[PDB]
RNA sequence: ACCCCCCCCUCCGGCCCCGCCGCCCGCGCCCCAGCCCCGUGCCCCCUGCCCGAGGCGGCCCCCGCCCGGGAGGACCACCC
RNA sequence: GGCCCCGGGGGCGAAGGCGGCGCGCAGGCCCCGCCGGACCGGCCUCUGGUGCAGAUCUCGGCAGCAGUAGCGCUACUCCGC
RNA sequence: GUGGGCCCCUCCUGGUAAGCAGGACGGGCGAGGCGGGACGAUCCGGACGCCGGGCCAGGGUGCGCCGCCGGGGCCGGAA
RNA sequence: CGCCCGGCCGCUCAAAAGACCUGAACCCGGCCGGCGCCGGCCCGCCGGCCCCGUCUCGAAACACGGACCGAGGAGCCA
């Protein structure tokens, strides 16, 4: 129920890379574009812009999509989906796909438990 | 967190103007009195020819949209220390409604301890052969109604300070005999040691 | 304001952010010490504790005086928490003492984004 | 059509009605200016309105409502007298009463009006004939009307 | 000096006095010269950092319409 | 078109809707709570009528304006009512 | 894809001249973020991944508004 | 069914699904809280920020298109 210890996680920026001129119309879609317009003003990067997405942004290779508690995520459907993927492993954690009902998220949970494997969404269903 | 009084006369316009806007952004209170006393260098016709030249200018279509040119010398100090406040922020109207700007010295302000600024003095600023002028003169020029008034108020309160300090000379006299505590001179010798 | 109840100080006042007139820092703030003229009479300011008081919730942060500005003994001070704007013109103390507030006083990208390798331990 | 008003655990009487032949703005401030009221000066105001003794006035729809002397102690100085709502809300207010006096033997001396709710309704459409052989709309705008009477507010 | 500024004259936020009648806040007074500058070229430098009431200076509060006439009037308002 | 280790997930609640956290430089993805009430996919290979802010765009709904602008042919009144 | 260019520095041609029109080596804007020149596509510096520290170009250092003192002088436009 | 004089209570049903599956946006009414984007700080201060798309040497332009919202909408095939 706990992972290895790792390098502290870094992420270079926090808040979501928005569309430009997305907070004045309601049909224009806050899902990032990049601008292309002659006069862009974005386009041109004048200060008090909104900043622009680059791969200069990316997450050091060692931590990226690790979760906040250290562990890497698997989602399953299946007991044996679950002994398969977790057969052996140390640095994942499984999580219960959403349609998944009640009587086989006990199945599953009991197997998990056994096996030492932590579960991301343990008491979602009561 | 106390008040600065300043005593307005002796003193330039613009250099003790600049003075007063860095204190009040500091967040300090302060107060200046006698501002018909203070002084503009130049001729007076010229500083005359400048004041009217800036009376000359209001909204063509409504004046009551227009600057407004305010006629007494409390007020002349106060716009030009506004034209160095950032006034139209909440920084700057703070700095705004902490000062204080009087013609003569009236009561609410009479027992206050008043300094100076002599950076910013005539007799060390100005050359004795340039021209100098007073606020005073200039408003009465430019309109404002109330000079022999400040002038009457001016003198019946001097003889009466002066009466005053005949009392203070005396009581000054018991004060300074406090030669006698030793609770203070066992300490005296301390602040020697260091001064 | 229960721990530094008792201690003496010499007084400085909070003016503004490091900036230029296209640019401002908040991560530095801009410093005015009483009695502290020149940039030479500033060895002896620096480095020292320092503090302002929050109005709301009554409480101090604590910081730390970094360096000289200017000529004219102007000093930058890291803070342990940015600072906001609505306290400019307010009171800085300069503790004449020693407190120990352990690391309450250093900036927080110092605090974390160090880099001494801190490895989350879990334990 | 539902209730907007959903407190619990109180004692109220509740009155209704939907799709109503009568000015949407006009209803609304007549409801809105009866609000809070005790039920029995409710109902003496209501017929004052009617005999014009007193007005409505009018926050929220006021472009081209006149300024008037009844109007000079309320917060705004614009109001008028709209009959066919004071109508509809008689009405309603009445049913609201009825049915709390039935529910609890309760009295009229300690019900107030504690709640309102007008929402607008699908007019009628008829036509109109404009120059030059051009044909434009002349719609109305009827409404939903609750009302809920009960125990003193505080 | 037909020029310019002020008075008279028009509007006028705010404020003041007087009628019927409680709260709060702060603690600091020489004057006048600068080619006499009269013995200078200082003080203050702790607004809490341990300060805390009279006198002297501030602050807040304090007052109906409907109704009908008119010398008043689009409606309002205004004067009775 | 296949696979999904005793044969993929589903009335012990599918698709969709409304709020909220997490992951990704991003396009986007994943989970939870409430609504809903019968279907839905991850990986490999195949196919295309495959991604919108604009075109005086098309069709539908609809706001401010606004309780606004506006309602020739002389004429009605009292009582039953 | 492009085959409408334009501006600066020096050198020129027509014209009284023009923010006029036509040519030349080199550079720039076009298609170049940032600071400065109050303000400007082109001037003065410097031409760009995301951050932390340091040094500083061009321009400047009474207050608005980040930054200073010492010393020696003086106190738009033609004939 | 009961009660007032259309309303309220409750009745069938898993459920009103009640003139009907789900029921988004634009826009609006009642109660509760407060008075544009980016950045720092817990939060109302300080700093930066002209209206996009287009033709153009050159657009914030007193150049043109565009009140709002949904769904459709343009390099495929031989
Ligand atoms: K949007
Ligand atoms: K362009
Ligand atoms: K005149
Ligand atoms: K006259
Ligand atoms: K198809
Ligand atoms: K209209
Ligand atoms: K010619
Ligand atoms: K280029
Ligand atoms: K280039
Ligand atoms: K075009
Ligand atoms: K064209
Ligand atoms: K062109
Ligand atoms: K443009
Ligand atoms: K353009
Ligand atoms: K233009
Ligand atoms: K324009
Ligand atoms: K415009
Ligand atoms: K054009
Ligand atoms: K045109
Ligand atoms: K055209
Ligand atoms: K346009
Ligand atoms: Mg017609
Ligand atoms: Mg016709
Ligand atoms: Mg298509
Ligand atoms: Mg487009
Ligand atoms: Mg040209
Ligand atoms: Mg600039
Ligand atoms: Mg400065
Ligand atoms: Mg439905
Ligand atoms: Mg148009
Ligand atoms: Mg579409």
């Given at each position: 129920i706990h992972p290895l210890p790792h390098k502290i996680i870094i992420k270079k920026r926090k808040n979501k890379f928005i569309r430009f001129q997305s907070e004045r119309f309601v049909r224009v879609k806050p899902s990032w574009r990049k601008p292309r317009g002659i006069d862009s003003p974005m386009r041109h990067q004048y200060r008090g812009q909104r900043p622009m997405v680059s791969i200069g942004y990316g997450s050091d290779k060692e931590t990226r999509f690790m979760l906040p508690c250290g562990f890497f995520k698997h989602r399953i459907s299946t007991v044996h989906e679950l002994k398969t993927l977790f057969m052996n492993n140390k640095t994942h954690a499984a999580q219960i796909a959403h349609g998944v009902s009640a009587r086989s998220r006990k199945q599953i949970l009991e197997e998990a438990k056994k096996m030492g494997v932590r579960v991301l969404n343990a008491d979602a269903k009561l | 967190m106390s008040r600065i009084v300043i005593d307005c006369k002796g003193h330039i316009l613009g250099r003790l103007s600049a003075i007063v806007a860095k204190e009040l952004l500091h967040g300090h209170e302060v107060a200046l009195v006698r501002c018909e006393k203070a002084i503009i260098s130049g001729a007076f016709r010229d500083v005359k020819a400048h004041y009217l030249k800036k009376m000359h200018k209001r909204t063509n279509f409504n004046h009551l949209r227009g600057p407004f040119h305010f006629r007494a010398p409390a007020e002349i100090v106060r716009r030009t220390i506004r034209g160095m406040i950032?006034?139209?922020?909440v920084r700057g109207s703070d700095a705004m409604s902490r000062l204080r700007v009087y013609d003569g010295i009236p009561p609410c302000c009479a027992r206050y301890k008043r300094v100076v600024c002599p950076s910013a003095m005539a007799y060390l600023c100005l050359r004795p052969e340039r021209r100098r002028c007073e606020v005073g003169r200039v408003a009465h020029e430019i309109g404002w109604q109330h000079a022999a008034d400040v002038e009457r108020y001016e003198k019946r309160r001097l003889e009466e300070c002066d009466k005053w300090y005949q009392d203070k000379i005396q009581i000054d006299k018991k004060i300074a005999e406090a030669a006698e505590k030793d609770a203070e001179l066992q300490r005296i010798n301390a602040e020697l040691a260091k001064y | 304001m229960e721990e530094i109840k008792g201690k003496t100080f010499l007084p400085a006042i909070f003016v503004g952010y490091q900036r230029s007139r296209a640019k401002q820092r908040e991560n530095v703030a801009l410093v005015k010490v009483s009695g502290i003229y020149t940039r030479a009479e500033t060895d002896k300011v620096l480095g020292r504790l320092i503090a302002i008081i929050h109005?709301?919730?009554?409480k101090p942060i604590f910081g730390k005086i970094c360096r000289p500005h200017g000529n004219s003994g102007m000093v930058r001070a890291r803070f342990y928490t940015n600072l906001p704007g609505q306290l400019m013109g307010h009171k800085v103390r300069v503790f004449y003492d020693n407190i120990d507030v352990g690391d309450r006083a250093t900036p927080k990208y110092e605090r974390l984004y160090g880099n001494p390798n801190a490895t989350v331990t879990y334990e | 059509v539902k209730y907007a008003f959903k407190s619990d655990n109180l004692l109220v009487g509740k009155s209704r009605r939907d799709g109503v032949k009568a000015s949407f703005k006009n209803t609304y401030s007549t409801c809105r200016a009866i609000k809070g009221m005790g039920v029995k000066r409710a109902f003496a105001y209501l017929d004052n309105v009617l005999n014009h003794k007193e007005i409505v006035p009018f926050f929220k729809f006021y472009k081209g409502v006149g300024r008037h002397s009844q109007a000079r102690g309320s917060g705004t100085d614009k109001g008028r007298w709209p009959e066919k709502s004071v109508v509809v809300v008689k009405d309603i207010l009445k049913q609201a009463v009825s049915n709390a006096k039935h529910a609890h033997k309760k009295e009229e001396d300690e019900l107030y009006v504690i709640s309102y709710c007008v929402n607008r309704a699908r007019g009628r459409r008829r036509r109109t004939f404009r120059a030059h052989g051009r044909i434009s709309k002349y719609e109305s705008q009827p409404c939903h009307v609750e009302l809920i009477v009960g125990p003193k507010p505080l």
């Open positions: - | 950032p006034y139209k922020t | 109005s709301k919730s009554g | -």
